[PDB]
Amino acid sequence: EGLNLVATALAVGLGAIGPGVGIGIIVSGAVQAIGRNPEIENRVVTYMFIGIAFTEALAIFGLVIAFLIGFG
Amino acid sequence: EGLNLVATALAVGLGAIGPGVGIGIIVSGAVQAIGRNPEIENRVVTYMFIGIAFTEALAIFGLVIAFLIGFG
Amino acid sequence: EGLNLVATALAVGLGAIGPGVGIGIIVSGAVQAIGRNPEIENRVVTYMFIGIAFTEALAIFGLVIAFLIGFG
Amino acid sequence: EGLNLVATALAVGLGAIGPGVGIGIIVSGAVQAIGRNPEIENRVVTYMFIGIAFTEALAIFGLVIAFLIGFG
Amino acid sequence: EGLNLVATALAVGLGAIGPGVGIGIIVSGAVQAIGRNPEIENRVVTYMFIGIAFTEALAIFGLVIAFLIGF
Amino acid sequence: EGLNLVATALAVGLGAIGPGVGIGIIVSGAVQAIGRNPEIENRVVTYMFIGIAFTEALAIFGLVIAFLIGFG
Amino acid sequence: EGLNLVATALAVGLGAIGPGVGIGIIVSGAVQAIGRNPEIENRVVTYMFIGIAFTEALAIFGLVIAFLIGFG
Amino acid sequence: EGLNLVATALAVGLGAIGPGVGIGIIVSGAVQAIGRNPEIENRVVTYMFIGIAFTEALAIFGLVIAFLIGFG
Amino acid sequence: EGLNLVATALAVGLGAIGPGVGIGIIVSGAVQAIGRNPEIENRVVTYMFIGIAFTEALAIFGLVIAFLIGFG
Amino acid sequence: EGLNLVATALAVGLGAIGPGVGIGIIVSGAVQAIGRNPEIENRVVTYMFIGIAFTEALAIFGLVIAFLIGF
Amino acid sequence: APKLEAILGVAISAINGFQSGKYDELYIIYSEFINTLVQRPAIKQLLPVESPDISTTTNVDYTYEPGEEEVLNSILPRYVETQIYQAVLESIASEHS
Amino acid sequence: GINPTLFIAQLINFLLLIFILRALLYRPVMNLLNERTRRIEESVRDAEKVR
Amino acid sequence: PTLFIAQLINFLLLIFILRALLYRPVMNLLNERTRRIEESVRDAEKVR
Amino acid sequence: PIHLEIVTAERVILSDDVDMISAPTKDGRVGILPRHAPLMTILEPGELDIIKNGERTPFAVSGGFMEVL
Amino acid sequence: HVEVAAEVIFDGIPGFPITNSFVVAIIIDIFVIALAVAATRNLQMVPRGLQNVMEFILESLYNLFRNINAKYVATAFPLVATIFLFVLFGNWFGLLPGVGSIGVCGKKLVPLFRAPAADLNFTFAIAVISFVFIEYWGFRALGPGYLKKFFNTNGIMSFVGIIEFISELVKPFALAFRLFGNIFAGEVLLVVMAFLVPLLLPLPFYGFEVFVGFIQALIFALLTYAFLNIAVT
Amino acid sequence: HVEVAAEVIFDGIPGFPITNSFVVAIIIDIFVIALAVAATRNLQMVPRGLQNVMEFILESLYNLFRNINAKYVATAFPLVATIFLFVLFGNWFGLLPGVGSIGVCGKKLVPLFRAPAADLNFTFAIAVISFVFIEYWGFRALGPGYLKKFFNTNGIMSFVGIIEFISELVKPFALAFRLFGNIFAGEVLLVVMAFLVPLLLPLPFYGFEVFVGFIQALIFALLTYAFLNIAVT
Secondary structure, X not given: OOHHHHHHHHHHHHHHHHHHHHXXXXXXXXXXXHHHOOOOHHHHXXXXXXXXXXXXXXXXXXXXXXXXXXXX | OOHHHHHHHHHHHHHHHHHHHHHHHHHHHHHHHHHHOOOOHHHHHHHHHHHHXXXXXXXXXXXXXXXXXXXX | OOHHHHHHHHHHHHHHHHHHHHHHHHHHHHHXXXXXXXXXXXXXXXXXXXXHHHHHHHHHHHHXXXXXXXXX | OOHHHHHHXXXXXXXHHHHHHHHHHHHHHHHHHHHHOHHXXXXXXXXXXXXXXXXXXXXXXHHHHHHHHHHO | OOHHHXXXXXXXXXXXXXXXXXXXXXXXXXXXXXXXXXXXXXHHHHHHHHHHHHHHHHHHHXXXXXXXXXX | OOHHHHHHHHHHHOOOHHHHHHHHHHHHHHHHHHHHOHHHHHHHXXXXXXXXXXXXXXXXXXXXXXXXXXXX | OOHHHHHHHHHHHHHHHHHHHHHHHHHHHHHHHHXXXXXXXXXXXXXXXXXXXXXXXXXXXXXXXXXXXXXX | OOHHHHHHHHHHHOOOOHHHHHHHHHHHHHHHHXXXXXXXXXXXXXXXXXXXXXXXXXXHHHHHHHHHHHOO | OOHHHHHXXXXXXXXXXXXXXXXXXXXXXXXXXXXXXXXXXXXXXXXXXXXXXXXXXXXXXXXXXXXXXXXX | OOHHHHHXXXXXXXXXXXXXXXXXXXXXXXXXXXXXXXXXXXXXXXXXXXXXXXXXHHHHHHHHHHHHOOO | OOOHHHHHHHHHHHHHHHHHOOOOOOEEEEXXXXXXXXXXXXXEEOOOOOOOOHHHHXXXXXXXXXXXXXXXXXXXXXXXXXXXXXXXXXXXXXXXX | OOOHHHHHHHHHHHHHHHHHHHHHHXXXXXXXXXXXXXXXXXXXXXXXXXX | OHHXXXXXXXXXXXXXXXXXXXXXXXXXXXXHHHHHHHHHHHHHHHHO | OEEOOEEOOOOEEEOOEEOEEEEEXXXXXXXXXXXXXXXXXXXXOEEEEEXXXXXXXXXXXXXXXXXXX | OOOOOOOOOOOOOOOOOOOHXXXXXXXXXHHHHHHHHHHHHOOOOOOOHHHHHHHHHHHHHHHHHXXXXXXXXXXXXXXXXXXXXXXXXXHHHOOXXXXXOOOOOOOOOOOOOOOHHHOHHXXXXXHHHHHHHHHHHHHXXXXXXXXXXXXXXXXXXXXXXXXXXHHHHHHHHHHHHHHHHHHHHHHHHHHHXXXXXXXXXXXXXXXXXXXXXXXXXXHHHHHHHHHHHHHHO | OOOOOOOOOOOOOOOOOOOHHHOOHXXXXXXXXXXXXXXXXXXXXXXXXXXXXXXXXXXHXXXXXXXXXXXXXXOOHHHHHHHHHHHHHHHHHHOOOOOOOOOOOOOOOOOOOOOOOOOHHHHHHHHHHXXXXXXXXXXXXXXXXXXXXXXXXXXXXXXXXXXXXXXXXXHHHHHHHHHHHHHHHHHHHHHHHHHOOOOOOOOHHHHHHHHHHHHHHHHHHHHHHHHHHHHHO
């Protein structure tokens, strides 16, 4: 009964669903903003990276479980 | 039969699904507004974070109960 | 048996996925409107919060239910 | 056998998924309209809340069953 | 065993998944159209409520099936 | 066994996720088109309704199953 | 064992949820495009229906499979 | 047991969601683009089909799995 | 008992649902931009196709896993 | 039993669900932005990719699990 | 008292020119009017570069509905036509004086 | 509770209700509103005839 | 039953807030409606 | 209660204060209220409507622009 | 002790079963007829008070229906106006205390004292009257009818139309189910959430429920007359 | 029928097992070498025939590379062009008849006819070679470089440098998996479409697959260039 394997897979996949769209939306919106007004560029990229990191935190949380299930 | 481990994995993954898109949309909109004009930028910057905070709350709620569902 | 454990975790995450995206959309729209017309910030924010926390209501509802699943 | 607990959890979570995004979209659109025409606020905001009411309908009904099974 | 309760829960929840987003979208679109064109309510409100009823048709069908299963 | 009830529930629930969003998107787009160009309103309304009808089929199909499974 | 009924339900619902949103976006976009200019009425509508064709085909396929689940 | 029926039902259902919504999005986008700029409509229409077929590919991939469930 | 067929169907369908709408958005945005400015068509369209591949790769990965489950 | 195969399938599929949508959004936005302004191309692509890659990391994570559960 | 409609017959072509590349500039020689007795001739540039002291514009921001590019492309010909019309009216006044 | 007896009896009750309200309130109210509207139109015509 | 007393108290409280929130708007709207009607009647009789 | 000015290359048509403007913007008809957000639009041949204390004046405009502070 | 129920008969069976749905239908009919005669008897050129309220309600409804369509507003106004008044007053009566608590004269079988729309029979009756009204006016206006909803591609593909016909069939079912589901689910909300902290908690959902009753009345009437407009065209 | 396997060993091992990636990939390399000599021998000022086709293909590839990046268009031109040509040739050869019907001369041996990238080894080797070339070019251009890969604290975030490093490391594995999965899935789709209705059913898709293969090849090349851009700045 490899139920812990299903736990591993479910955690990884559901942690991938959310940020997989979150980073996409952030990058698309910020790239559009760059395309219109490039002068503020550097400034918004600080916000874009801040947001990408906040979103991947959630993602890596699942990744944490991905090992906590695997190794003890 | 190891069902609590799947509980923990499901909790973490589902808590990651929603807020990922939430902060993604938040940051995309904030960068959009900032690229429209930088003068109001700082103001909306604060709002971004507080909005993110609220969304992160949901995420961390799962994370919090993740511990409560893992070590309890 | 961990059926109640899985139920608690599932309630948390499944009630969290929706309101997170709702708050994301709320913040993005409010920030975009503020950037377009700053002078009405104090009004639109008055709705922003009474939307954001409002969605949290549903979320915390599920969270409350989760606690009732946990011990109760 | 705690299948009823999972039933209540599924009811509350799947109920909360939809109306959360619905409220997010309604609030975003309402705030955009406020930013466009402030003086039509007292009308469109009305059309805001009524719409929000419907969302809560689709939540509370599920929430109703989220309690109906929870206590029998 | 408790499978009927899971059935009722699935019915109501999956009924509420879609029409909630639908009513959100229609209300937001109508409010935006009114904000852009204030004097167009005369048909916008009517079509908004028609669309809201048509969205809620799926949710009421889910609720009816939940009532049928529960009893 | 209760798989009859679960089948009815999945036939009515799934098959309502899609048509609800379809109705919302169709009628919101029609309303926005009316706001932009009122003069052609009735014309586009025709297509709107037929589009409605199409996804309404994808609703009642499930309902038909949700009745047949109910009636054997 | 009532897995046949749940198979029919899953097939019909999951074949309905996708094409429903698909044709919803179809009609919304087509109505808006006609709103910008009705002179392309002859072309758009033609291509419009092609959309409703292809998506619905998928649904019909699922529906066909549903019948194949009932009989064999 | 009867899990083959559920398997083929999921194979035809799942995998008809994403392609269907993608076809909806593509036809709506091509409609709007030709509505604003008809002078290139044929040409961009070509791209439209190069989109749809690719989406169909994913769908038909699931489709073939359906037969691989019936024929083992 | 037949869990391998269910696994194959889940793999193919869940792989197809995401990148399907992904590539739909790909080509829809490409056609939008082409309608905006035909001259840049020589560049972005190329990027279009790489995205079409580079997204669909994820989807096709699932299909590979499906085959890896179809016959070990 | 065969639960490991179901786990591998769930990992790959649920990993693929989100990144597909996200990458579609990224490339659509970048293409539209370049179509509006061509001279900023080499910048947005430079950001495009350093965005796009991040997303598949999550997906690749699933694929990694899709093998770790497999063997 | 002519109407702007008149200068259009010529200004359309001069502009279609700065667009067809056929020209790389358009100057108008018109008769200014300094004093009821003085009427110095003068030249003005008709290329719509604009961009005055950021102080003059105050950077008023708007949500250009058709788009910044479309608004600019439809407003520059009207601006140069208005400049030509103003020059023609000043020339008529100087002629009469 | 899909008894044909209750269904048909409730339908008959609703027909009676709609007919009573049509013969008692809706027609008098519509008549009064139409009279007031035509009276306002006649007032406009009367101002024109005064001029 | 305690359900009955709960129903009264909830209904009365809701009536209280509903009155305090909508008595001015609804009664006003009626007042301007009848005022417009009567001033139209006055204008009609003056013109006659 | 917004300071409306219908100006023209020849003369000024109106300079009064108006309740509502049913402007025919190129993308779609736009209504304007005393506190409308800043805007700049291109009109198309149509019939602009001025709502002044419940009175509708249909000023036909064959084309022109609009700046809304 | 939530004691939720779908349909009840509350005795009253002198050979013919008289459900408490008929009890509440009759009491609401008495109330609406009393209001009607009170408004009509004191007829004045300048209306005030109750007459003003009734005139305003019908004027708003008539304006809305003319906005939907101008030709058949006067013909179809009685049906839709009665629909709105009757079901609105039923839903609002569904909020009066004693929805389930009354019944103490043996389980507490209840005098309905709620909306008659909380039972399937009432909603089905209203749905079928609306549907037959729509079909009769469709035959009267379009003539032979079925130009669409019966194959015959004529500028619109015939494939769409079998779908319209089945949509036409499901529309009365959708309307009746919407009214019943909304009212019954709101009732169960009130009772079940009164099971939890019955004091000071039910007020927000209470107000939400009175709003939902009014909105359900208006939306059902609007959908009926809009379906009439669709059938005519 | 409808049988396909990811492991191929073939036969005739002269001290080392000669897999399927040594009898159809070697043939593809020989064909590529011939293409570099069957049209580049009789060079002319005015290209014509096969020379003109090769010149047009090279010009299109060079234009695409320059659009991607001009500072190293010729620096990475050899490896990118070789990878694109080999991948396109393998994809074209995989759709030829006898791909799975060969080896009968005991089960049939897919080798000597399958696509070069169908095997999980040849595609992985090509991706590893491309990644090594990209890394060497980046090291040469930026010296030590790898400021983002060093996870050094910057003004963007303190958690950066790990996700970027993970993505860069997975890039070779991602490219190998993409190529191998695309080729194997194309072959499996052809076989499956042949399983049911073997005649005339798999006409379009397989052909489209060929086009897809071409795109796949280009995508790989583009990805390589993109990797260089990631190394460039």
